[PDB]
């Protein structure tokens, strides 16, 4: 029963800008994609939608799967990190609902690529991947005979 830490992230893109959330780790203001831990009884995409809401008050469904990164953090924590893409027709207001989050900012790709205050190296990596331009359907990591309810219409 080895079990990894499973997380989801969102690359949220609007007019040449990527949504980043700021957070103080221990003493330091760091940037990340809107992300978090997968929960019980929840679908990956539902995780991602939730996390997006909690950290940014933005309420939007993920559009495409981009990729998953398997990595160990330097505290030695094992993650499987699933990265999604959400395109929006325009930038929108943000307000976090999760006190972990100090503020949100919309920033350019170069501003994330060049930055030194990133939560972890995968923050940068997610942009490279997104910029590559290859996207994948959501069903490809989809639930199967799932017992609980999901969306509607």
User: Domain residues of the chain, as ranges?
Assistant: 1-153
Resolution in A: 2.7
The 3-state DSSP class for residue 107 equals strand
Alpha helices in 25-89 (DSSP H): 44-56
**Residues with Cβ within 8 Å of residue 133, at least 6 apart in sequence:** none
Rounded CA Rg of the chain:
15
Of 138, 134, 124, the C-alpha closest to 31 is 124
For residues 84 and 45, the answer to whether their CB atoms sit within 8 Å is yes
Per the entry, the structure determination technique was X-ray
For residues 43 and 6, the answer to whether their CB atoms sit within 8 Å is no
Fold classified for 1-153: Nucleoside Triphosphate Pyrophosphohydrolase (3.90.79)
Rounded Cα gap, residues 121 and 149, in angstroms: 35
Rounded Cα gap, residues 63 and 61, in angstroms: 6
Of 34, 68, 74, the C-alpha closest to 54 is 34
At 107, phi and psi to the nearest 5?
-140, 160
Q: How many CB atoms lie within 10 A of CB 134?
A: 9
Alpha helices in 20-86 (DSSP H): 44-56
**Residues with Cβ within 8 Å of residue 151, at least 6 apart in sequence:** none
Of 141, 128, 144, 151, the C-alpha closest to 6 is 141
Query: In a 10 Å sphere around its CB, with 0-12 CB exposed, 13-18 middle and 19+ buried, how is residue 48 labelled?
Result: buried
Q: Which two tokens stand for residue 140?
A: 């490809």
Query: In a 10 Å sphere around its CB, with 0-12 CB exposed, 13-18 middle and 19+ buried, how is residue 126 labelled?
Result: buried
């Amino acid at each position: 029963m080895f079990k990894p830490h499973v997380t989801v992230a969102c690359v949220v893109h609007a007019e040449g800008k990527f949504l980043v959330v700021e957070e103080t780790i221990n003493g330091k203001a760091l940037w990340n994609q809107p992300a978090g831990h997968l929960e019980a009884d929840e679908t990956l995409v539902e995780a991602a939608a939730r996390e997006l809401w909690e950290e940014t008050g933005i309420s939007a469904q993920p559009q495409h799967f981009i990729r998953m990164h398997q990595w160990i953090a330097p505290d030695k924590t094992p993650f499987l990190r699933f990265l999604f893409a959400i395109e929006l027709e325009q930038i929108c207001p943000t307000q976090p609902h999760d006190s972990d989050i100090d503020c949100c900012r919309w920033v350019s790709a170069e501003e994330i690529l060049q930055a030194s205050n990133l939560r972890s190296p995968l923050v940068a990596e997610s942009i490279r991947c997104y910029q590559s331009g290859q996207r994948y359907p959501l069903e490809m990591i989809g639930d199967f005979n799932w017992p609980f309810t999901k969306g509607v219409i």
